[PDB]
């Protein structure tokens with residue numbers, strides 16, 4: 625956050641814990657909104673042989 | 681009835697019939713006309729006792745395999761409809777119905793097509809499959825569809841344009857054709873594929889990997 629150090633001390637004292645360690649707002653540690661494409665593997669039944677439907 | 685079956689009937693009636701049974705093994709009696717073609721020194725049509733060993737037939741009448749017996753690679757014993765056998769089986773096999781059934785190929789028409797070690801065996805089996813594709817009458821679904829399917833698969837196999845798993849797939853495709861058609865043309869189209877897969881799978885896999893690393 626962009627809070628002044630004295631305000632951080634006042635907040636920490638009032639709450640009783642270290643607030644800057646766990647901020648509710650998300651600044652930069654989140655995932656990027658543009659991602660590479662996936663590959664998404666296939667299931668067990670995607671075989672070419674020994675895959676008769678009556679057995680499964 | 682076959683022309684050969686009909687033709688021998690008067691001779692069987694005259695000479696005795698019990699004379700006919702004196703040739704060959706039990707339930708494999710009489711004399712047979714053999715057509716030896718392919719990679720032999722003297723391809724020819726001959727008449728021989730029914731239960732003659734294949735090697736003796738090829739050596740005595742056809743002049744032997746081209747380049748010697750050690751150059752033998754494969755034999756289709758009874759025409760294209762019969763599965764082929766390698767050199768290790770041709771050493772002691774008898775040229776009758778029951779012996780060739782025990783070798784998993786059948787006697788068929790007693791037409792011996794010989795292929796030496798200098799032939800592309802996959803290409804020859806693909807040519808047979810293409811023959812069956814062009815000769816299917818198209819009446820029933822398994823032949824009309826599966827034979828053309830196997831033809832395309834074998835064309836891709838010849839160039840190595842497949843992956844090893846498809847080999848098993850091809851096997852199953854043939855198993856879906858055999859026993860499910862109206863006539864035996866589907867069976868006779870599936871059998872050479874099964875023989876090639878049974879005896880020459882490493883050749884298929886080697887071609888596949890050569891195509892794989894040749895094309896990245």
Ligand code: SF4
Nearest residue numbers: 817819820823861863
């Ligand atoms: S199996 Fe026989 S009847 Fe069926 S499509 Fe082929 S040739 Fe015609």
